[PDB]
């Protein structure tokens, strides 16, 4: 059997497909599969067979998966490509813009009956097997992976103008034979019921690393199509979640060992990664997140000490040289990977925990305050590396929703004033860091720096540039989320509402230049920076928005004209995608490769333009609220306002005595400096630098969005009211 197997896979995986018609190839594959299922489902030996035949089935379904994929690149019948098609009624796969027509033919060619019956054969062979055969069952899980690989679909593109396909990568149809066979197989799963999922749960909890990965992938793809949740119900009923969460206590200890010099092999890291991915799959469900919150997961994480230790260097000591393996990343990177899943699950639970998001955010802020030291170090760390940008982005994702004084007003109530003041002092630390974030990375020189940082390797340099650019985009969007939440919360107040900025365009002009790029210039974040930051960022965003808008339009033109392009440009595009190409490969393959590059880049630019419009409109909101506060409520030092000079600036004053020092003074956060001369100079500077060209650009840009969240127009209100407030002075 060893020889016969090795023979057949040497026939398959190494021989060129071209020598024999793939129709006959797959036909023979399924014929062999049916006959072997006959023989072995009927059994021909005892336990001694399942290992060897299980590896056989492993590689057989591997070869069949990739071979059916080989047919997926070629049309069969009289029409699988071209102007007219008359064979698509034979399958749940149908026509689409270039790419899906060749795929649909590959399944309309094959007898779905044979596929379904043979996978039945697999599954029944599986279910009659007993336990204690972990590597046999590993072959089995991988075989199931190999089959469902064929039925797997990729992620959808991101389009703005709606000029490329967004169909048949999902199940959104009564059709999609993919989905219907998935439903049938879901029924067979539930027919297997408790025993099968008992087996898979035990195998995922105590199995072997590879088999754990196989089981996790199987579960993820099954859950991605399940709508009946028997699995969630049973795992909830059985308390597997309890033992799994208690295993995170062991995760903490092992990772605390791993942080030491010369860490052991990465298998423990892989184990913790797989556990965290499983918990992410859990949190995907709203109910799963509910039970995660009910279990006090964040409490256990806070009681764990692993994130408290962070590899950080000093200008002294033996620092500057690692005794850890050079083939593994930096220990600081490893700690980043350690802390990352906790933050991911936190941002998922805060988003999906809307009903109990009060308690979710309370636990999240407990996590933050427990780990604020490392959090503060990351906030105060100026790196420029992709990892650091992701760190700050996810930190802001947590803070913009969690670090709200409303959460302290709704929970933690009745606590002592010492606890209140410590919590609020940390909160103010977070606002000051968030404010300094804009000063650090709202500048334009970051664009040049990050564009130059990715010229070392051009294969992934484009991806790196897009990643850092998008990361900055979410960071901007996200600090703005924090600001908007704060402003909405403080809106009903009329004596405790202060504006974070002071009016000036001197700093607007100053920021357009360099920030003495040895240390990034920051306006004083304990002393309330200026609206010049807002206007400069808004103008820069408008410029870059026209940039990415126009290049996106041209890229869409290229994507639609890819059929008309000559061999050389498409060859260049395929070389830019993968280090293999030229005209020896099929023209269709070349078109597909070029189109896939264009799809990913269009997705990047579309996300960019959408979020940039977000920041634009939120900048409008900022300008509106600042103008409302200043022109209507702030006391002026050049005259006596009618009823506004009796109105103090927002928030009350400290009773604690401090000396004005140029570092960490929240006492300066409480005072705005407003005068009539300031108002006049600001109005003239706005009238001059806020050109009608900029206004028309804003108005024409804001004429296509807001459809996703579908709330009635506020955009024209902000634009017009900002325009009026610019022409309206102090009363």
């Amino acid at each position: 059997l060893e020889s016969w197997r090795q023979l057949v896979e040497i026939i398959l995986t190494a021989c060129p497909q071209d020598l024999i018609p793939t129709e006959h190839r797959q036909l023979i594959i399924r014929d062999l599969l049916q006959d072997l299922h006959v023989k072995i489902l009927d059994d021909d030996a005892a336990q001694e067979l399942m290992p060897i035949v299980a590896g056989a089935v492993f590689t057989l379904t591997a070869h069949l998966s990739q071979s059916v994929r080989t047919e997926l690149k070629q049309p069969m019948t009289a029409s699988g490509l071209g102007q007219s098609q008359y064979v698509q009624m034979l399958d749940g796969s149908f026509a689409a813009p270039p790419g899906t027509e060749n795929i649909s033919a590959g399944f309309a060619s094959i007898g779905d009956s044979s596929l379904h019956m043979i996978l039945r054969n697999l599954l029944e062979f599986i279910l009659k097997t007993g336990g204690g055969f972990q590597r046999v069952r590993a072959h089995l899980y991988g075989s199931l992976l190999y089959y469902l690989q064929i039925a797997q679909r990729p992620d959808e593109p991101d389009t703005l103008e709606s000029a490329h396909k967004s169909m048949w990568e999902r199940l959104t149809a009564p059709e999609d034979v993919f989905s219907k066979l998935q439903r049938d197989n879901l029924s067979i799963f539930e027919s297997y019921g408790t025993a099968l999922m008992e087996v898979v749960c035990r195998d995922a909890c105590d199995g072997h690393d590879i088999g754990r990965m196989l089981a996790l992938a199987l579960l993820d793809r099954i859950v991605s199509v399940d709508r009946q949740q028997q699995w969630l119900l049973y795992l909830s009923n059985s308390g597997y979640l309890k033992v799994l969460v208690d295993s995170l206590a062991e995760d903490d200890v092992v990772l605390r060992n791993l942080l030491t010099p010369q860490p052991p092999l990465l298998k423990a890291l892989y184990i913790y990664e797989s556990k965290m991915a499983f918990l992410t799959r859990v949190a995907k469900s709203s109910q799963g997140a509910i039970e995660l919150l009910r279990s006090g997961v964040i409490v256990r994480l806070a009681q764990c000490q692993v994130y408290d230790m962070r590899p950080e260097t000093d200008p002294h000591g033996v620092f500057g040289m690692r005794e850890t393996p050079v083939f593994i990343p930096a220990p600081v990177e490893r700690y980043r990977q350690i802390l990352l899943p906790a933050l991911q699950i936190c941002q998922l639970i805060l988003t999906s925990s809307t009903a109990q998001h009060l308690q979710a955010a309370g636990q999240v802020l407990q996590f933050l305050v427990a780990h604020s030291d490392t959090i503060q170090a990351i906030l105060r760390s100026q790196e420029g590396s992709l990892g650091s940008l992701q760190e700050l982005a996810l930190l802001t994702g947590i803070i913009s929703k969690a670090a709200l004084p409303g959460v302290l007003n709704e929970l933690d109530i009745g606590l002592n004033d010492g606890s209140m003041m410590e919590l609020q002092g940390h909160i103010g630390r977070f606002q000051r860091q968030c404010l300094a974030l804009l000063n650090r990375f709202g500048g334009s020189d970051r664009l040049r720096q990050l564009s130059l940082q990715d010229d070392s390797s051009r294969l992934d340099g484009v991806s790196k540039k897009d990643d850092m650019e998008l990361a900055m985009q979410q960071i901007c969007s996200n600090v703005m989320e924090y600001c908007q939440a704060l402003m909405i919360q403080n809106s009903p107040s009329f004596q405790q509402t202060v504006c974070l900025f002071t009016p000036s365009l001197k700093e607007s002009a100053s920021r357009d230049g360099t920030r003495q790029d040895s240390q990034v210039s920051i306006l004083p974040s304990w002393r309330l920076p200026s609206l010049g930051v807002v206007i400069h960022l808004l103008k820069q965003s408008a410029n870059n928005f026209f940039t990415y808008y126009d290049i996106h339009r041209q890229s869409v033109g290229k994507l639609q004209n890819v059929e008309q392009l000559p061999p050389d440009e498409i060859k260049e595009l395929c070389q830019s995608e993968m280090p293999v190409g030229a005209d020896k490969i099929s023209t269709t393959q070349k078109y597909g490769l070029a189109r896939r590059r264009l799809v990913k880049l269009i997705n990047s630019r579309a996300k960019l333009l959408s979020l940039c419009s977000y920041i634009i409109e939120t900048c409008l909101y900022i300008l509106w609220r600042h103008l409302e506060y200043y022109l209507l409520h702030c006391t002026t030092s050049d005259s006596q306002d009618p009823v506004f000079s009796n109105m103090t600036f927002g928030n009350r004053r400290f009773q604690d005595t401090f000396n004005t020092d140029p570092n960490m003074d929240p006492r300066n956060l409480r005072q705005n400096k407003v005068s009539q001369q300031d108002v006049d100079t600001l109005l003239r500077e706005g009238a001059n630098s806020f050109g009608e060209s900029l206004q028309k650009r804003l108005l024409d840009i804001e004429s296509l969005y807001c459809k996703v969240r579908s709330r009635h127009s506020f955009i024209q209100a902000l634009v017009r009211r900002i325009r009026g407030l610019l022409r309206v002075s102090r009363v």
Partner: protein
Amino acid sequence: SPSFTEDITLSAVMLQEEDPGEAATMSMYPDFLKSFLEHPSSAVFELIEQYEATCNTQITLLKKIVKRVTPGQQKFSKTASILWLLQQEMVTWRLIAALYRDRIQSALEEE
């Protein structure tokens, strides 16, 4: 609004299953038959009110569904087309009911 929540969960199912429009259409018929059996053929006006109010609730739910997703996607174009057909179904129901109730009361007022 709870209806918004059932919209969210049915849309979570409906992204992995058929388009919302066909399910919404098929959901109405049992209410049709319930009203027809519980109500006589002289209370046709209250029966029309039942159709209208309930199928307005389905319009409510279907726009609740379609509003949150990206409309620039062609997946929802067919569902939306069926949806505008549903609004035309409103207007057809309203038009027939108005014309023929007007005819009845005109026969009444022909004094």
